[PDB]
Scaffold this active site. Structure first.
Site, PDB file in Angstrom:
ATOM      1  N   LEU A 193      32.195  39.958  24.070  1.00 19.55           N
ATOM      2  CA  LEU A 193      31.234  39.627  23.025  1.00 19.55           C
ATOM      3  C   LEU A 193      30.271  38.522  23.430  1.00 19.55           C
ATOM      4  O   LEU A 193      29.123  38.516  22.972  1.00 19.55           O
ATOM      5  CB  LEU A 193      31.969  39.201  21.746  1.00 19.55           C
ATOM      6  CG  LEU A 193      32.908  40.233  21.119  1.00 19.55           C
ATOM      7  CD1 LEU A 193      33.648  39.624  19.936  1.00 19.55           C
ATOM      8  CD2 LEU A 193      32.144  41.477  20.687  1.00 19.55           C
ATOM      9  N   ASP A 226      27.749  20.546  17.497  1.00 20.08           N
ATOM     10  CA  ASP A 226      27.092  21.628  18.220  1.00 20.08           C
ATOM     11  C   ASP A 226      26.420  22.601  17.259  1.00 20.08           C
ATOM     12  O   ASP A 226      26.318  23.798  17.550  1.00 20.08           O
ATOM     13  CB  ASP A 226      28.085  22.378  19.116  1.00 20.08           C
ATOM     14  CG  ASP A 226      27.412  23.060  20.303  1.00 20.08           C
ATOM     15  OD1 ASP A 226      28.049  23.938  20.923  1.00 20.08           O
ATOM     16  OD2 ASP A 226      26.252  22.720  20.617  1.00 20.08           O
ATOM     17  N   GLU A 244      39.557  35.002  14.088  1.00 21.92           N
ATOM     18  CA  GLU A 244      38.931  36.017  13.255  1.00 21.92           C
ATOM     19  C   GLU A 244      37.773  36.682  13.991  1.00 21.92           C
ATOM     20  O   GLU A 244      36.951  36.009  14.622  1.00 21.92           O
ATOM     21  CB  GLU A 244      38.446  35.360  11.958  1.00 21.92           C
ATOM     22  CG  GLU A 244      37.419  36.137  11.146  1.00 21.92           C
ATOM     23  CD  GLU A 244      36.869  35.318   9.991  1.00 21.92           C
ATOM     24  OE1 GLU A 244      37.050  34.083   9.995  1.00 21.92           O
ATOM     25  OE2 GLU A 244      36.255  35.910   9.081  1.00 21.92           O
ATOM     26  N   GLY A 270      30.171  31.654  28.090  1.00 23.39           N
ATOM     27  CA  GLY A 270      29.457  30.449  28.458  1.00 23.39           C
ATOM     28  C   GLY A 270      29.821  29.995  29.859  1.00 23.39           C
ATOM     29  O   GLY A 270      30.146  30.826  30.711  1.00 23.39           O
ATOM     30  N   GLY A 271      29.777  28.685  30.119  1.00 23.53           N
ATOM     31  CA  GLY A 271      30.093  28.193  31.448  1.00 23.53           C
ATOM     32  C   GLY A 271      31.577  28.068  31.717  1.00 23.53           C
ATOM     33  O   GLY A 271      32.016  28.254  32.857  1.00 23.53           O
ATOM     34  N   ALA A 287      22.877  29.533  17.674  1.00 24.26           N
ATOM     35  CA  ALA A 287      23.824  30.402  18.359  1.00 24.26           C
ATOM     36  C   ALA A 287      25.251  30.241  17.855  1.00 24.26           C
ATOM     37  O   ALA A 287      26.099  31.084  18.169  1.00 24.26           O
ATOM     38  CB  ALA A 287      23.789  30.139  19.868  1.00 24.26           C
TER      39      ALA A 287
END
Ligand SMILES: CCn1c(-c2nonc2N)nc2c(C#CC(C)(C)O)ncc(OC[C@H]3CCCNC3)c21
Ligand SMILES: [Mg+2]
EC number: 2.7.11.1
Length: 263
Positions: free
Chosen positions: A15, A136, A91, A18-19, A140
Site C-alpha cells: 500500500l 507529522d 486497521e 517510506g525510508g 499524506a
C-alpha cells in the site's frame, strides 16, 4: 518480507512505503479479516535507534482509541532468514490520502474541506488529551475511506507528554518544544492546501520554506482561490499564527470555529 508473518498474517499487495518501513495489505488468517501491516525494513532493522522508534510508534498509536485514528490491533517480530522483522498490525483503511486527492482532483470544495479537517481536529484533540503529539500532520498522513470517514495515521515520530518543511510550525522547526498548538499549526497548513490547492509556503530549499514560516505572513486563501469566504480566511490565518499564544490553543477550539463557518 516473507509470505506470512508468524504463520498468521498473509501479506498481500503493498500500500505504501517510506525510508525505514513499508505497509502491506494483509489477511488475518485466524479472524478472517483484512488488516494493514507496517513492517520495519530489514535493510536496517538491527540499529536499535530504529527498533525503539518502531516499538514506540506501536505503543503510542495503541494508547489511542478513536474512530478518526487508525487502530492498532497487534505487533511482534517475524522470524526471517535475515533475522527478526518487527511489524505492526492495524486497521485497514480502504481509501486515499489528502495528498492524492489534491494532486489528482485539485482543491476540495470549502464545505467538504471543513468537514474533513474538522474531523481531523477531533482526532488530534483526542491525541493531545491523552498526552501524545503527532508532530507529522500533513496531507499524506490523513486518509478518507470509501465510507468518507477521516483517518489520521503514521504516528512514527509522535512524542508523548522531524516532518516535512511545508507543514512544520515556527517552533517545531528549529527543535524548540512542541505542544498541541504545533499540531494545530500543521493542521492549518493542511487546511490551506485542500482549499487552495497548494501549501501556504513553498520554496526551492527547506531553509527557504522554514524562513517563511517564521517571518512571512501567508497569502489569504481567498486571494489564492475563488469561492472562499472571508470567515474561512480568518480560521485558516488564526491556525497559522506565528506565536502559539495567538493560534487556537487546542484542536477542539479550531474545530469549534470551523463549525461556525459551515453553519
Ligand atoms: C500506507 C498507508 N498507511 C496506512 C494504511 N493504509 O491503509 N490502511 C492503513 N492503516 N497506515 C500507515 C501508517 C501507520 C501507522 C500507525 C497508526 C501504526 O502509527 N504510516 C504510514 C503509512 O503510509 C505512508 C505514506 C507516507 C508518504 C508516502 N508513503 C505513504 C500508512
Ligand atoms: Mg507518512
Amino acid at each position: 518480507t516473507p509470505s506470512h508473518l508468524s504463520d498468521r498474517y498473509e501479506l498481500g499487495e503493498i500500500l505504501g512505503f517510506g525510508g525505514m518501513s513499508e505497509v502491506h495489505l494483509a489477511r488475518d488468517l485466524r479472524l478472517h479479516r483484512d488488516v494493514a501491516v507496517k513492517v520495519l525494513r530489514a535493510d536496517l532493522a538491527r540499529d536499535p535507534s530504529f527498533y525503539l522508534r518502531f516499538r514506540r510508534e506501536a505503543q503510542n498509536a495503541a494508547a489511542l482509541n478513536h474512530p478518526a485514528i487508525v487502530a492498532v490491533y497487534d505487533t511482534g517480530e517475524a522470524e526471517t532468514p535475515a533475522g527478526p522483522l518487527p511489524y505492526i498490525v492495524m486497521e485497514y483503511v480502504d481509501g486515499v490520502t489528502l495528498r492524492d486527492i489534491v494532486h489528482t482532483e485539485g482543491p476540495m470544495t470549502p464545505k467538504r474541506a471543513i468537514e474533513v479537517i474538522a474531523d481531523a481536529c477531533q482526532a488530534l484533540n483526542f491525541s493531545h488529551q491523552n498526552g501524545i503529539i503527532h508532530r507529522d500532520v500533513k496531507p499524506a498522513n490523513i486518509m478518507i475511506s470509501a465510507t468518507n470517514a477521516v483517518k489520521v495515521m503514521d504516528f512514527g515520530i509522535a512524542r508523548a507528554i522531524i516532518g516535512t518543511a511545508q507543514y512544520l510550525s515556527p517552533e517545531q522547526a528549529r527543535g524548540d518544544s512542541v505542544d498541541a498548538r504545533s499540531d494545530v499549526y500543521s493542521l492549518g497548513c493542511v487546511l490551506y492546501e485542500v482549499l487552495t490547492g497548494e501549501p501556504p509556503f513553498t520554496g526551492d530549499s527547506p531553509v527557504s520554506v522554514a524562513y517563511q514560516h517564521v517571518r512571512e505572513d501567508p497569502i489569504p486563501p481567498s486571494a489564492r482561490h475563488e469561492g472562499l469566504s472571508a470567515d474561512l480566511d480568518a480560521v485558516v490565518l488564526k491556525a497559522l499564527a506565528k506565536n502559539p499564544e495567538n493560534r487556537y490553543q487546542t484542536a477542539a477550539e479550531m474545530r469549534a470555529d470551523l463549525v461556525r463557518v459551515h453553519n
